[PDB]
Amino acid sequence: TFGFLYVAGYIGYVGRQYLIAVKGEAKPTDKEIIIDVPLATKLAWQGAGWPLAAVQELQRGTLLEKEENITVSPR
Amino acid sequence: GWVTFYWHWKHLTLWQGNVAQFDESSTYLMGWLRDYLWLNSSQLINGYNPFGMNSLSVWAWTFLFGHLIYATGFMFLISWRGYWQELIETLVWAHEKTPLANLVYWKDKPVALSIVQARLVGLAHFSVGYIFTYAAFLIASTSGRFG
Amino acid sequence: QAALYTHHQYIAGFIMCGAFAHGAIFFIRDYDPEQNKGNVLARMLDHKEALISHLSWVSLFLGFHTLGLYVHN
Amino acid sequence: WTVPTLNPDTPSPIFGGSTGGLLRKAQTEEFYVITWEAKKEQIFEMPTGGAAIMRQGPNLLKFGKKEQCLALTTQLRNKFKLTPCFYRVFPDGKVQYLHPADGVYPEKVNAGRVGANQNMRRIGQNVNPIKVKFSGRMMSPAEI
Amino acid sequence: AHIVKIYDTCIGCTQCVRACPLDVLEMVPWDGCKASQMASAPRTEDCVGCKRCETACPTDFLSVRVYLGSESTRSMGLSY
Amino acid sequence: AKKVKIAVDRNPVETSFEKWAKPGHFSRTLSKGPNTTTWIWNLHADAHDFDSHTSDLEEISRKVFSAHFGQLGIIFIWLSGMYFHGARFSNYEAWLSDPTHIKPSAQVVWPIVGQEILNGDVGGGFQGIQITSGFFQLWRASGITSELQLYTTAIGGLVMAAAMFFAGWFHYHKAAPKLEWFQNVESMLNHHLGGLLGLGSLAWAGHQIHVSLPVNKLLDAGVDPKEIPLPHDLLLNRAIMADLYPSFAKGIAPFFTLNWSEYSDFLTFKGGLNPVTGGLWLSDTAHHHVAIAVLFLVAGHMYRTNWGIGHSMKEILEAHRGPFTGEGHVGLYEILTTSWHAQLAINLALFGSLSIIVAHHMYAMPPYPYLATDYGTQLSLFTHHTWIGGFCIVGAGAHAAIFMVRDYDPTNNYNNLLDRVIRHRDAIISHLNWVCIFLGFHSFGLYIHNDTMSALGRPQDMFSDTAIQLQPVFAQWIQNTHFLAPQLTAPNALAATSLTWGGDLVAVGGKVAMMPISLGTSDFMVHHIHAFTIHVTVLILLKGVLFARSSRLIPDKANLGFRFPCDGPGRGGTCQVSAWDHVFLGLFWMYNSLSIVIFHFSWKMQSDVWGTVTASGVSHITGGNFAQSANTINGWLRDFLWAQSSQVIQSYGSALSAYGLIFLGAHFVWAFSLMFLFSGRGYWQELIESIVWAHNKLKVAPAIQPRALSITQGRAVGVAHYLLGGIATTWSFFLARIISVG
Amino acid sequence: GMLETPVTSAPIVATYLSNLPAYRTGVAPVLRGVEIGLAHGFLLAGPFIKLGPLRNVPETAEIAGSLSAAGLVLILALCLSIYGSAQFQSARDPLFSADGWSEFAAGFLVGGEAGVAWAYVCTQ
Ligand code: CLA
Ligand code: CLA
Ligand code: CLA
Ligand code: CLA
Ligand code: CLA
Ligand code: CLA
Ligand code: CLA
Ligand SMILES: CC1=C(C/C=C(\C)CCC[C@H](C)CCC[C@H](C)CCCC(C)C)C(=O)c2ccccc2C1=O
Ligand SMILES: CC1=C(C/C=C(\C)CCC[C@H](C)CCC[C@H](C)CCCC(C)C)C(=O)c2ccccc2C1=O
C-alpha cells in the first residue's frame, strides 16, 4: 500500500510542479504539447522528497487555492 | 444485473450442493461467462429444436423475444432524428404521387419522433428486453434444473 | 426464491432512479433560493462541485481496481 | 418605398423539373413565390435539387416553405449580387409580401422599425420558475 | 410558436440577423450600445428553432435566446 | 493537342525539420496553437484532409502522390517482416516435408510473466503461434524451399521500402510533377493496363513456367526439398527442364512458329484440383497468367497519347447519349480529371467489390497447394477479404458524398446524368425504401414464422426442406450447367472450374479439400437475408450522397459542409442530417450484413463441406446440421453460437488461451462503445466542469482547457469501438474454433 | 416544376386508371364499393385456403380458408367506416364526403362478402 502511494504521489507531485512552473511563461499551452525536457528532468529528480514538500505546503497554506479565485456556476 | 447475477449463481451452486464451483470460478470473468451464463443456457435454448419441443419452449421463445426488443432499442438510441425525418419526406412524396392510394390521406402529418421521445422509447425497448431476457433465463435455468 | 429476489431488486432499482428524478424536478420547478437562504439545502448547492468530483473519484477508483483485479485473475 | 405587387405572368427560370417541388400543402394551406431581376442568363442551384437557368430580366419561382425561398435569396444575393423578394400565396389568391419586410434587408438597421421581444435585462436577471408557477399554462421566466 | 427574446447585453453586431435562415430577426435603432442598434424579433411565427442565431452571438452570456414552444406547420419546418 | 510529356518543378519545398516542431502548421486554423483539448483532436482529424488546407489542385496532387509512396514503403516493410519471420522464426522447412501433419507457425513469444504457454506444440520440433495467413502455402507455390530464399526476399523488401520512401521525398521536395502531368488519364491507363498489369502478369507467368512448375512438380512426386535443383539450375540447364517437360527441348521456336500446341505439357486447361495438394494445377495458373498478360497488353494500346491513334476518353463519353437521359455523359471527363474524391469514390467501390469476389473465388477454387485442407487458413482468408471489401465500399459512399458537397458544381452539370439523378432522388430513395421493407418482412419474417411454429409444436407448418419448401431453383440450375460445361460448352476443359458445382470430392491427408455444395431451403432463406442487408446499406449510403447538398428538411445543407453534427433542435430536431452521419449509420449496417455473410460461410463449410474422409465415408465437422437448424433464429443461437463457442471459452491454460482473453476483451470494447453512442457531450462537458473545479482547488488545472469530445467525434469514437469490439469478438471465436477442430 | 415521366403521364396508363371504379365518377358510391368489394373479396380467399393452418385437411380447407377471408372483409369494412368518420367531419365527387363514404363502405362489405362466397362456390 505505501509502496504505491509513494510512487503515485511522486508522479502527481512532479506533474503539479511542472504545471505551476510553466504557467509563468509567455505561452503556457506551448509547454504542454512541447515538453520542456530540461525543466521536466530537473523536477523528476527532485520529486523523491515530495512527502516532505507536500506537508510544508499544506502547513504553509499554499497547497490549496482560495475560494474567491475559483469559478463556479450560478446557484 | 450484477447484483442478481451474483445472487442467482451463488444459490444455483448452493442448491446443487457444489459451492466450490462458485468459490473457484467467480474470481475471474471467464468463469462467469462459461460457468454461469453459457453452462446454464443449455436447457433453455433447447425448449424447442428440430427434434421437438417441451414446456421450456415458451421461455426459449421469450428469451429470443427479449434479445430482439433489446436490439430494436439500439436503433432509437444510436440513430437520431434528422436521418429519419428526411426519410419520411420521401414517403410523403411517394404516397401523394401513387394512384389509388392518394385517394386516402392522413389527418396528422407524419413526422419522425422527437429527440426526447427517441431517448425514452429507445430506453423502453432496452429496458423491456433487458428484463424479459433475464426473466426467461432465470426461470428456465432454475425450474429446468429443479422442476 | 430466485424470482422474488430478482423481482423486488429490479423494482427497487427503478424506484431509486425516480426518487432522484423528482429531486431534480424539485430543484427546477419548486425550489426558491430566497426562502432557503443559508439552510442545509441551499448549502448543498454551494459545494456541488465538491460532491460531484468526490463521487467521480470513488467511481474511478472502484472501476480501475475492481476491473483490474478481475483482468489480472 | 412601397410594397411591391406580385405579377403571376412573370416567366420562370429554364428548368426541367424534379420530384423535390410542391406537394398538396400548396393547394390547401399556402406556398411561397420568389421573384428577382437577372442581368444575364446564368446557371444557379435549385434548393430542391438540380441546376436551373435564370432568364434575363424578371424571374419567378414557387416553393413549399419559407426557408426554401430565403435559401435561394441568400445564394442569389451573395453569389450573383441580386435583390430578390418573395411572398406568401394563399389558396384563395391572397398575397402577403414578406421579404424584405420594409424594403431594406433586416441586417441593415433602418428607421421606423419598432423593437419586438426585447427584454431590458440580462439573462441572469430572470426570475426563478417557482415565481411563475400556476400562471395558466407552461411559460418560462423569460416570457415575463 | 417558439419564443425568441433579445436582452440588453446586445452589442448590435448584426450577426444573429445575418445567420437566421428564416428571416425572424432584424436590427432596430437603439441607444444602449455603442453601435446604436439592437436586435429585434418581430416575426417569431416563422422561427423554426434552429438556434443558428444563438450560435452567432458573441456576448457572454447570450443576448438572443430561443425557447422552444408549441409546434405548428411553420415551426416544424414542414413543406407538406 | 497538348503533348503528353514529363513536367516537374525543381526544388519546390525545402527539406527541413522546422515544421516538425510546429504542430498544426498545415492549417490556417490550427497553426496558432492550442487553447483547448479540442485542438489536439482537430490536429489529427485534419492531417490528411489535403484539400481543406489549400485550394490549389497542383499542391493537393503532389501531396497525394508522395503520400502514396509512403503507403507503399510501409507495405514493403510489412511484407519484408513476414518473409523475415518466415526465415527466422518459423517451422517452414519442417512443414515442407510434412505439410499435412504440421501446423504453420511464424511467431514466437519471449518467456516472460508466464506468456510462453502461447508457444504451442505445432509440430516439426517447433513451438510458436499457429498462423492463418497462408504464407506457407503461398511460398510453396512459388517454389521456395529454404530459409535462405525467404531471408533474401526480406532484405530486398527493405531495399524497396527505402526506395519508396526516397521516391516520396524526391517527388515532393525535389522534382514534383505539375498538375498537367497528373491529368494525363489516357497515358496513365495505357501504362497501368499494359505495363503494371500486363507486364506484371507476363513476368509472373515467367516465374511460374521456369521456377514454380518444375519445383512443385518434384515436390508433388515425393522428392525431398533439399534434393530438388535450385531454381537457377533449372534456368541455365535446358536439359533438366526437358526431362520434366519435353516441349522445352524445342526452345522458343514453337512460340514464334505458332506451333503453340507443343507447350501443352506445361500450358494446360485441366480445371478442377490437383489430387495431391488439393489446389489448382499450377500449369493452369501459368496459362492463365500468360493469357491475362496478352489481354492487358492489348488493352494498354486503346487510348490516344501522342501519335494520333487511340481513343479520346472525352470523345467516347460525349458520344454515348440517348433519348431518355438528356445530355448524358457530358461533363464527367472534367469531373474525373479535377476531383480526387470523385476518383476515390469509384476506385474504392470496385476495389472493395473486387476484394469480396476474391474471398468467394479463393475458397471455391483454392489456388495454393495444401490450402484447402488447412481449414484455419480457409476460414481466415475468406473472412479477412470480405471485411476489407465491406469497409472499402463504405468509403466509396463517404467520398462520393464529399465530392457532392465540395467539388460538385451546377454550372458544369446541366441536364446531364448527374443532374438528372439529383432531380428524381425522391423517386429513387422512396422505391429503395419500399424494397428494403419488402425484403425485411419476407426474409427475416420467415425465420420469425419458423421460430414461432417450432415453439408451438407445429413443425409441419415451417418453411423447411421437410415442410413448405423454398428451393433456390435458379441457383440449382446454374450449378448443373457449370458441372456439365466440359462436355458441351467448354469442350477443351478436362474438368469444371470448381468442385462446388458437382461431381466427386477431393481428399488430401484424410480430409475434404472441396466437394459439391448443395443448396436447400436454408440456403434460400439466408441468401435473401444477404439481399436485405445489402439493400439497406445501399439505402443509407445512397441517401447520404443524393441529399448531401440539400433536402426538403435542410434546404442549404451544402453550406453546412460534409461533416457537421446537426442544424439544431428546431424543425422538430435535425440530429445527424449531414452526409458524414449517413456513413456513420452505414458502417453499422455494413457490419450487420457482413457478420451474417461470414456466419453463413462458417456454418455451411463446417456442416456440409469440411470433414474427415474414411472408409465409412465423409463425416463433417458439425455433421450436416445446417440444413435443418439454420432456418430458425434459435437454431443459430443454439447450434452455431452456443455450440461452437465451446472451444474459445475453454481455451484457458492452453496455447489458444490468448483467443479466450481477446474474446472477452472484444466484448468489453464493444460494450464500452455504447457509452459514446447512447449519450451526448453536453452531459460530459458539465461533468468535466466539476472535475476541473477539483484541479483548480489544488492548483493543478491544465493550461489547455479540457473539453468533452465534439458531437461528431463522439459518434466516430462510438462506431470505431463498436466495430473493433464486434469484429475482434468474431475473430477470436473463429480462430479458436477452427484451429482446434480443423 | 414537377417531373413528368411516361409512367406518370401516358395515354394508355391514364385511360386505364379512369376506367377503374375508384376513378369512375358519376357512379353511385354504393355501386363503387360493391365493384371494388367484389374484386378484393374474391382474391382474398386464395392465400387463406392454400396456406392456412387447415390447408392439408381435405374438405375443411375450403371452408376454413373462405371463412377466414370473410372475417378479414369484415375487419376491412370496419376500417373504411372509421376512416370516413375521421376524414370527413366538416366535395365534387360524392364519394369524398361523410354520407358518400359511409355508403361506399357499406357496398364494400356486401361486395366483399359476396366475392368470398363466390370464390368458395368456384372451388366446390
Ligand atoms: C409514486 C410514483 C410516481 C409518481 C406519482 C410520479 C409522477 C410523475 N412523474 Mg415520476 N417517476 C417515478 C415514479 C412516480 N412519478 C419513477 C419510479 C421513476 C423512475 C422510472 C420516475 C421517473 C420520472 C421521470 C423521468 C419523469 C417523471 C415525470 C412524472 C410526472 C408525469 C408523468 C407522466 O405524464 O407519465 C406519462 C407516462 C407514460 C406516457 C407511460 C410511460 C411508459 C413507460 C416508458 C414504460 C412502458 C412499458 C411498456 C409499455 C411495456 C410493454 C411490455 C410488452 C411485453 C407488451 C408526474 C408528476 C415526468 C415529469 O415531467 O415530471 C415533472 C418526467 O419527466 N417521473
Ligand atoms: C462496459 C461498458 C462501460 C464501461 C467500461 C464504462 C466505464 C465508465 N463509465 Mg460508462 N457508460 C456505459 C458503459 C460503460 N462505461 C453505458 C452503456 C452508458 C449509458 C450511455 C454509460 C454512461 C455513463 C455515464 C453517464 C457515466 C459513466 C461513467 C463511467 C466511468 C465509471 C468509473 C470507472 O469505472 O472508472 C474507471 C474506468 C474504467 C473502468 C474505464 C476503462 C479503463 C480502461 C481499462 C483503461 C485501459 C488503458 C490501457 C492502457 C489500454 C489503452 C489502449 C488504447 C490506448 C488503444 C468509466 C469511465 C461515469 C464517469 O465518468 O465517472 C467519472 C459517468 O458519469 N458511464
Ligand atoms: C527526412 C526527410 C524529410 C523532412 C525533413 C521533411 C520535411 C517536411 N516535409 Mg517531407 N517527406 C519526406 C521526408 C521529409 N520531409 C518523405 C520521405 C516523404 C514521402 C512520404 C515526404 C512527403 C511529404 C509530403 C507529402 C509533405 C511533406 C511535408 C513536409 C513538411 C512538414 C513535415 C511534417 O510536419 O512532418 C511531421 C509528420 C510526421 C512525423 C508523420 C510521419 C508519417 C510517416 C509516413 C510515418 C508513419 C508511420 C507510422 C508507423 C504509421 C502508423 C502509426 C501507428 C503504428 C500508430 C516539411 C517541410 C508537408 C508540407 O506541408 O510540405 C510543404 C507535405 O505536405 N513531406
Ligand atoms: C509502366 C509504367 C508504370 C507502372 C509500372 C506504374 C506503377 C504504379 N503506379 Mg503509375 N504511372 C505511370 C506509369 C506506371 N505506373 C505513368 C506514365 C503515369 C503518369 C501518367 C503514372 C502516374 C501515377 C500516379 C499519379 C500514381 C501511380 C501509382 C502507381 C502505383 C499503384 C499501386 C500499385 O499497383 O502498386 C504496385 C506496386 C508495385 C508493382 C511496385 C513497383 C515498383 C517499381 C519501382 C516500379 C514502379 C513504376 C515506375 C514507373 C518505375 C520507374 C520509376 C523511375 C525510377 C523512372 C504503381 C506502383 C500510384 C502510387 O502509388 O504512386 C506512388 C499513384 O498515385 N502512377
Ligand atoms: C517475362 C517472362 C519470361 C522471361 C524473362 C523468360 C526467360 C527465359 N525463358 Mg521463358 N517463357 C515465358 C516467359 C519468360 N521467359 C513464357 C510466357 C513462355 C511460354 C510461351 C516461355 C517459354 C519458354 C521456353 C519454351 C523456353 C524459355 C526459355 C527461357 C530462357 C531463354 C530465353 C531465350 O532464348 O532468350 C533469347 C534472348 C533473349 C531473351 C535476349 C537477352 C538479352 C540480354 C539480357 C541483353 C543484355 C545486354 C547487356 C548490354 C549486357 C551487359 C553485360 C554486362 C556484364 C556488362 C530465359 C531464362 C528457354 C530456356 O532455356 O528455358 C530454360 C526455353 O527453352 N521460355
Ligand atoms: C484509399 C482509402 C482512403 C483514403 C485515401 C481516404 C482519405 C481520406 N478520407 Mg476516407 N474513408 C475510407 C478510405 C479512404 N479515405 C474508408 C474505407 C472509409 C469508411 C470507413 C472512409 C470514410 C471516411 C470518412 C467518414 C471521412 C474520411 C475522410 C478522409 C480524409 C481525411 C482522413 C484523415 O485525416 O484521417 C486522419 C486519420 C485518423 C484520425 C486515424 C483514424 C483511425 C481509426 C478511427 C481507427 C483505426 C483502428 C486500427 C485499424 C485498429 C486498432 C488500433 C488500436 C488498438 C491502436 C481523406 C481525404 C474525412 C473527410 O472529411 O474527408 C474529406 C472523413 O470525415 N473518410
Ligand atoms: C433488431 C434490431 C432492429 C430492427 C428490428 C430494426 C428494424 C428496421 N430498421 Mg433498424 N437499426 C437497428 C436495429 C434494428 N432495426 C440499429 C441497432 C440501428 C443503428 C445502427 C439501426 C439503424 C437503421 C437505419 C439507419 C435504417 C434501419 C432500417 C430499418 C427498417 C428496415 C426495413 C424492414 O425490414 O422493415 C420491416 C421490419 C422488420 C424486418 C423488423 C421485424 C418485423 C416483424 C417480424 C413483423 C411483425 C409483424 C406482426 C404483425 C407484429 C404485430 C404486433 C402487435 C401489434 C400485435 C426496419 C424498420 C432502415 C429503414 O428504415 O428502411 C426503410 C434504415 O434506413 N435501421
Ligand atoms: C426508427 C426511428 C425513427 C422512425 C420511427 C418512427 C417514425 C415511428 C414509427 C412507428 C410506427 C407507427 C409503429 C408503431 C408501433 C408501436 C408498437 C405502437 C405503440 C403505440 C402505443 C400507444 C401502445 C425516428 O423517428 C427517430 C427519431 C429520433 C431518433 C431516433 C429515431 C429512430 O430510431
Ligand atoms: C465518455 C464520453 C465523453 C468523455 C470522454 C473524454 C473526455 C475523452 C477522454 C480521452 C482521454 C482519456 C483524455 C486525455 C488523455 C491525454 C492525452 C493524457 C494521457 C495521459 C497518459 C499518457 C498517462 C465525451 O466527451 C463524449 C462526447 C460526446 C458523446 C459521448 C461522449 C462520451 O461518451
B147: amino acid identity, one letter: G
Confirm if E20 and D74 have CB atoms less than 8 A apart: no
The alpha carbon of residue F693 is apart from the nearest alpha carbon of chain C, in Å, by: 7
G104: amino acid identity, one letter: F
CA distance F740 to F606: 13
Q: What cell was used for D11?
A: 416567366
Closest listed ligand to the CA of B69: 7
Pick left, alpha or beta for residue C70 (phi over 0 → left; psi -120 to 50 → alpha; otherwise beta). Answer: alpha
User: Do the chains contact at F461 and G3, CB–CB below 8 Å?
Assistant: no
B23: amino acid identity, one letter: D
- Positive/negative CA dihedral, C32, C35, C36, C38: positive
Cα–Cα nearest to F185, from F50, F57, F309, F312: F312
CA distance F601 to F297: 37
DSSP string computed for A50-69: HHHHHHHHHHHT-SS--GGG
Chains touching A by CB (3 or more pairs below 8 Å): C, F
Burial of A67 (0-12, 13-18, 19+ CB in 10 A): exposed
Q: What cell was used for B12?
A: 444455483
F265: amino acid identity, one letter: D
User: Chain D: residue nearest G4 by CA?
Assistant: D17
Classified as helix, coil or strand, F102 is coil
User: Do the chains contact at F570 and E50, CB–CB below 8 Å?
Assistant: yes
Longest CA pairwise span in chain C (Å): 55
CA distance F716 to B64: 30
**CATH top-level class for F3-742?**
mainly alpha
In which element (H, E) is residue D96 found? strand D95-99
Cα-Cα end-to-end distance for chain E: 18
Cβ contacts of D78 within 8 Å, gap of 6 or more: none
Q: Which is the closest atom of ligand 7 to the Cα of F444?
A: 39
Classified as helix, coil or strand, F557 is helix
D137 touches chain E (CB under 8 A): no
Q: In whole angstroms, how far apart are CA F607 and each of D22, F219, F476, F600?
A: 56, 32, 19, 11
CA angle B6, B7, B8 (to 5 degrees): 95
| Domain residue limits, chain F | 3-742
Which residue is closest in CA terms to ligand 9's atom 33? F676
Cα–Cα nearest to F231, from F291, F135, F152, F292: F152
CA distance D114 to B47: 75
Confirm if D73 and D45 have CB atoms less than 8 A apart: no
Cβ contacts of B82 within 8 Å, gap of 6 or more: F553, F566, F567, F573, F574, F575, F576, F577, F581
Q: What cell was used for F532?
A: 436485405
Indicate the DSSP class of residue D121. S
Q: What cell was used for E41?
A: 424579433
| Domain residue limits, chain D | 1-143
F402 strand-pairing partners: none
Which residue is closest in CA terms to ligand 8's atom 12? B110
Contacts of E21 in chain F (CB under 8 A): 556
User: Chain C: residue nearest F688 by CA?
Assistant: C53
How many beta carbons lie within 10 A of that of residue G81, not counting itself?
16
Chains touching F by CB (3 or more pairs below 8 Å): A, B, C, D, E, G
Dihedral of the CA atoms F230, F231, F232, F237 (nearest 10)?
90
Cα–Cα nearest to F297, from F212, F162, F203: F203
C2 touches chain B (CB under 8 A): yes
Alpha helices in F19-146 (DSSP H): 38-45, 50-53, 57-88, 92-97, 135-141
Cβ contacts of A30 within 8 Å, gap of 6 or more: F33
Cα–Cα nearest to G40, from G80, G68, G69, G79: G69
Dihedral of the CA atoms G37, G40, G46, G49 (nearest 10)?
-40
Classified as helix, coil or strand, F311 is strand
Name residue, grid cell 498537367: F180
Cα–Cα nearest to F95, from F24, F20, F146: F146
Which residue is closest in CA terms to ligand 3's atom 39? F20
User: Do the chains contact at D47 and F556, CB–CB below 8 Å?
Assistant: yes
Name residue, grid cell 426459449: B60
Backbone φ, ψ for residue F411 (5° rounding): -60, -35
Dihedral of the CA atoms D100, D103, D109, D112 (nearest 10)?
-120
The alpha carbon of residue E1 is apart from the nearest alpha carbon of chain B, in Å, by: 16
| Beta strand ranges found along F183-222 (DSSP E) | none
Q: What is the b/e burial string over B42-81, where b = at least 16 CB atoms within 10 angstroms of the residue's CB?
A: ebbbbbbbbeebeebbbbbbbbbbbbbbbeebbebbbbbb
Classified as helix, coil or strand, F702 is coil
Q: Which of G76, G87, G95, G108 to mutate to test the interface with B (most CBs of B within 10 A)?
A: G87
User: Do the chains contact at A29 and F34, CB–CB below 8 Å?
Assistant: yes
Q: What cell was used for F424?
A: 428524381
In which element (H, E) is residue F9 found? strand F8-10
CA distance A12 to A6: 10
Range of the domain at E77: 1-80
Classified as helix, coil or strand, F107 is strand
Cβ contacts of D144 within 8 Å, gap of 6 or more: D127, D132
How many beta carbons lie within 10 A of that of residue F92, not counting itself?
25
In which element (H, E) is residue E3 found? strand E3-7
Q: Which of residues 68-107 of B touch E (CB under 8 A)?
A: 89, 92, 96
Indicate the DSSP class of residue F17. S
User: Do the chains contact at B138 and C10, CB–CB below 8 Å?
Assistant: no
The alpha carbon of residue E21 is apart from the nearest alpha carbon of chain B, in Å, by: 17
Longest CA pairwise span in chain D (Å): 61
DSSP string computed for F618-656: EEETTTT-HHHHTTSHHHIIIIIIIHHTHHHHT-TTSTT
Query: Is F667 labelled a binding residue?
Result: yes
CATH number at residue E32: 3.30.70.20
How many beta carbons lie within 10 A of that of residue F191, not counting itself?
16
How many beta carbons lie within 10 A of that of residue D111, not counting itself?
8
Cβ contacts of D23 within 8 Å, gap of 6 or more: B92, B93, B96, D64, E79, E80
The alpha carbon of residue F33 is apart from the nearest alpha carbon of chain A, in Å, by: 7
Strand order in the sheet with F105-107: F105-107, F127-130, F120-121
Task: State the count of interchain CB pairs (< 8 A) between C and F.
Answer: 16
CA distance D78 to F434: 40
Confirm if F186 and F95 have CB atoms less than 8 A apart: no
Dihedral of the CA atoms G22, G28, G30, G36 (nearest 10)?
-20
Q: What cell was used for E79?
A: 413543406
How many beta carbons lie within 10 A of that of residue F696, not counting itself?
17
Q: Is the CB of F13 under 6 A from ligand 3?
A: yes
Indicate the DSSP class of residue D45. E
User: Chain F: residue nearest C57 by CA?
Assistant: F691
Confirm if F151 and F88 have CB atoms less than 8 A apart: yes
Q: Is the CB of F196 under 6 A from ligand 2?
A: no
User: Do the chains contact at F415 and D48, CB–CB below 8 Å?
Assistant: no
Strand order in the sheet with D57-63: D57-63, D31-38, D85-89, D95-99
Indicate the DSSP class of residue F10. E
CA distance F527 to F524: 5
B49 strand-pairing partners: B52
Burial of C66 (0-12, 13-18, 19+ CB in 10 A): exposed
Closest listed ligand to the CA of F78: 3
Classified as helix, coil or strand, F61 is helix
Q: What is the b/e burial string over F677-695, where b = at least 16 CB atoms within 10 angstroms of the residue's CB?
A: bbebbeebeeebbbbbbbb
Alpha helices in chain D (DSSP H): 24-28, 66-75
Cβ contacts of F231 within 8 Å, gap of 6 or more: F143, F210, F211, F215
Confirm if G44 and G113 have CB atoms less than 8 A apart: no
Indicate the pairing of strand F175-177 with strand F120-121.
Answer: unpaired
Contacts of C70 in chain B (CB under 8 A): 27-29
Among the partner-chain residues D44, D50, D74, the one whose CB lies closest to the CB of F423 is: D50
CA distance G66 to G49: 7
Cβ contacts of F88 within 8 Å, gap of 6 or more: F147, F151
| Beta strand ranges found along chain B (DSSP E) | 48-49, 52-53
Confirm if F130 and F739 have CB atoms less than 8 A apart: yes
Q: In whole angstroms, how far apart are CA F61 and each of F178, F342, F561?
A: 8, 14, 22
Q: In whole angstroms, how far apart are CA F739 and each of D26, F120, F415, F561, G4?
A: 66, 12, 58, 48, 61
Q: What cell was used for F577?
A: 442530417
Q: Is the CB of F448 under 6 A from ligand 7?
A: yes
Question: Where does D1-143 sit in CATH, by number?
Answer: 3.30.1470.10
Do chains F and B meet with 3 or more Cβ pairs nearer than 8 Å? yes
Confirm if F62 and F12 have CB atoms less than 8 A apart: yes
F694 touches chain C (CB under 8 A): yes
Number of domain units in chain E: 1
Cα–Cα nearest to F738, from F375, F400, F235: F375
Q: In whole angstroms, how far apart are CA F521 and each of F447, F608, F627?
A: 12, 14, 8
CA distance F145 to F230: 9
Q: How far is CA F445 from the centre of its chain?
A: 31
Q: What cell was used for F496?
A: 469444371
DSSP string computed for chain G: -BPP-TTTS-HHHHHHHHHSTTT-TTS-HHHHHHHHHHHHHHHHHHHHHHHSTTTTSTTHHHHHHHHHHHHHHHHHHHHHHHHHHHH-----STTSSHHHHHHHHHHHHHHHHHHHHHHHHHH-
- Positive/negative CA dihedral, F476, F478, F479, F485: positive
Rg (CA), chain A: 15
Contacts of B89 in chain E (CB under 8 A): 79-80
Q: In whole angstroms, how far apart are CA G92 and each of G25, G95, G96, G101?
A: 9, 9, 8, 13
CA distance F630 to F643: 13
Query: Is E33 labelled a binding residue?
Result: no
Dihedral of the CA atoms F312, F318, F320, F324 (nearest 10)?
170
Cα–Cα nearest to E52, from E7, E21, E14: E21
Among the partner-chain residues C2, C6, C70, the one whose CB lies closest to the CB of B28 is: C70
**Residues comprising chain C, all counted:** 73
User: Ligand 6 mean position to F8 CA, how many Å?
Assistant: 30
Confirm if F211 and F228 have CB atoms less than 8 A apart: no
Query: Is E10 labelled a binding residue?
Result: yes
Indicate the DSSP class of residue F4. P
Q: Which of F40, F48, F392 to mutate to test the pocket of ligand 6 (most atoms within 8 A of CB)?
A: F48
CA angle F34, F722, F446 (to 5 degrees): 150
CA distance F482 to F495: 10
In which element (H, E) is residue D62 found? strand D57-63
User: Ligand 5 mean position to F235 CA, how many Å?
Assistant: 9
F587: amino acid identity, one letter: L
Q: Which is the closest atom of ligand 5 to the Cα of F254?
A: 25
Confirm if F359 and F389 have CB atoms less than 8 A apart: yes
Contacts of E76 in chain F (CB under 8 A): 571-572
Q: Which is the closest atom of ligand 2 to the Cα of F678?
A: 20
Alpha helices in F403-520 (DSSP H): 417-422, 425-455, 473-483
Binding annotation of B for chlorophyll a:
67, 75, 83
Q: Which is the closest atom of ligand 6 to the Cα of F352?
A: 17
Q: Which of F434, F438, F441 to mutate to test the pocket of ligand 7 (most atoms within 8 A of CB)?
A: F441
Cβ contacts of F123 within 8 Å, gap of 6 or more: F91, F94, F95, F98, F101, F102, F103
User: Ligand 9 mean position to F709 CA, how many Å?
Assistant: 7
E7 strand-pairing partners: D119
Which residue is closest in CA terms to ligand 2's atom 10? F675
In which element (H, E) is residue A11 found? helix A2-22
User: Do the chains contact at A75 and C49, CB–CB below 8 Å?
Assistant: no
Pick left, alpha or beta for residue E43 (phi over 0 → left; psi -120 to 50 → alpha; otherwise beta). Answer: beta
CA distance F107 to F85: 7
Do chains G and A meet with 3 or more Cβ pairs nearer than 8 Å? no
How many beta carbons lie within 10 A of that of residue A53, not counting itself?
15
